[PDB]
Amino acid sequence: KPNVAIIVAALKPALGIGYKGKMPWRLRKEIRYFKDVTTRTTKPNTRNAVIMGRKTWESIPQKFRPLPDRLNIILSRSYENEIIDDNIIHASSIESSLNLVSDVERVFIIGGAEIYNELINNSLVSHLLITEIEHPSPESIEMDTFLKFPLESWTKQPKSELQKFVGDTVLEDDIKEGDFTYNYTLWTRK
Numbered sequence: 689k690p691n692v693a694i695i696v697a698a699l700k701p702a703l704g705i706g707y708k709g710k711m712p713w714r715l716r717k718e719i720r721y722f723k724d725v726t727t728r729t730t731k732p733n734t735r736n737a738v739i740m741g742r743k744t745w746e747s748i749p750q751k752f753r754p755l756p757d758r759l760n761i762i763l764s765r766s767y768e769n770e771i772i773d774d775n776i777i778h779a780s781s782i783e784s785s786l787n788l789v790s791d792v793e794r795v796f797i798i799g800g801a802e803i804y805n806e807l808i809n810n811s812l813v814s815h816l817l818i819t820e821i822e823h824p825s826p827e828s829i830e831m832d833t834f835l836k837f838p839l840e841s842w843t844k845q846p847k848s849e850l851q852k853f854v855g856d857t858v859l860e861d862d863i864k865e866g867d868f869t870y871n872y873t874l875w876t877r878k
């Protein structure tokens with residue numbers, strides 16, 4: 689089996705993630721956390737996979753595309769299940785994409801909304817890496833895109849389990865970037 693996790697940054701308490709196809713924030717440490725965790729492998733001869741919707745792919749800046757050091761899987765309902773090049777796979781589903789290569793250690797679902805809100809209730813996903821973002825006045829930030837997670841069916845793990853998961857990665861508490869404050873968290877199924 690492949691270890692499949694969801695990684696996302698969301699604003700509490702509504703868990704908003706975007707506005708008009710855009711990200712409502714630019715968090716410099718968070719971006720860097722995202723990179724290190726999705727890239728890091730333990731075993732040699734392995735890579736990690738990043739799975740995403742077509743729209744999230746289209747929104748990734750030209751030069752960061754495909755996301756380096758990781759296998760990129762792009763999801764569309766139009767896609768045949770084929771390898772485009774060494775770094776890029778097109779797929780109809782996660783299940784179809786997993787049966788396409790075997791060099792993968794960890795699989796990370798990286799967005800967007802339609803992808804998250806569907807794969808949250810898929811049994812393959814065993815971990816959630818949610819960056820919980822806070823703001824003194826959350827409603828002042830314009831938001832039309834939200835997570836629909838039944839978090840009552842999941843367990844927020846201790847920091848020690850997250851540290852285990854992300855290896856040596858530095859996990860700072862209450863990161864203050866402008867008016868935003870955030871923490872990295874780990875969730876497992878009940």
Ligand SMILES: NC(=O)C1=CN([C@@H]2O[C@H](COP(=O)(O)OP(=O)(O)OC[C@H]3O[C@@H](n4cnc5c(N)ncnc54)[C@H](OP(=O)(O)O)[C@@H]3O)[C@@H](O)[C@H]2O)C=CC1
Nearest residue numbers: 696697706709710741743744763764765799800801802803
């Ligand atoms: N804060 C965060 O950590 C993140 C936030 N975001 C935000 O999310 C938003 C984007 O989300 P969203 O608009 O939903 O776009 P998505 O990235 O989720 O892409 C949607 C597309 O994915 C394809 N798709 C959806 N479900 C499936 C499925 N079950 N099987 C195969 N393909 C599927 C469809 O492609 P098709 O139509 O071609 O068939 C659909 O049009 C943006 O606002 C972005 O800023 C994104 C990533 C991270």
Ligand SMILES: CCc1nc(N)nc(N)c1C#CCc1cc(OC)ccc1OC
Nearest residue numbers: 695696697719722747748749798799819
């Ligand atoms: C913002 C980076 C990020 N952090 C967390 N915790 N989860 C995520 N899924 C993401 C993401 C994403 C997609 C994306 C990545 C990117 O390179 C960093 C640039 C743009 C992106 O979508 C607009």
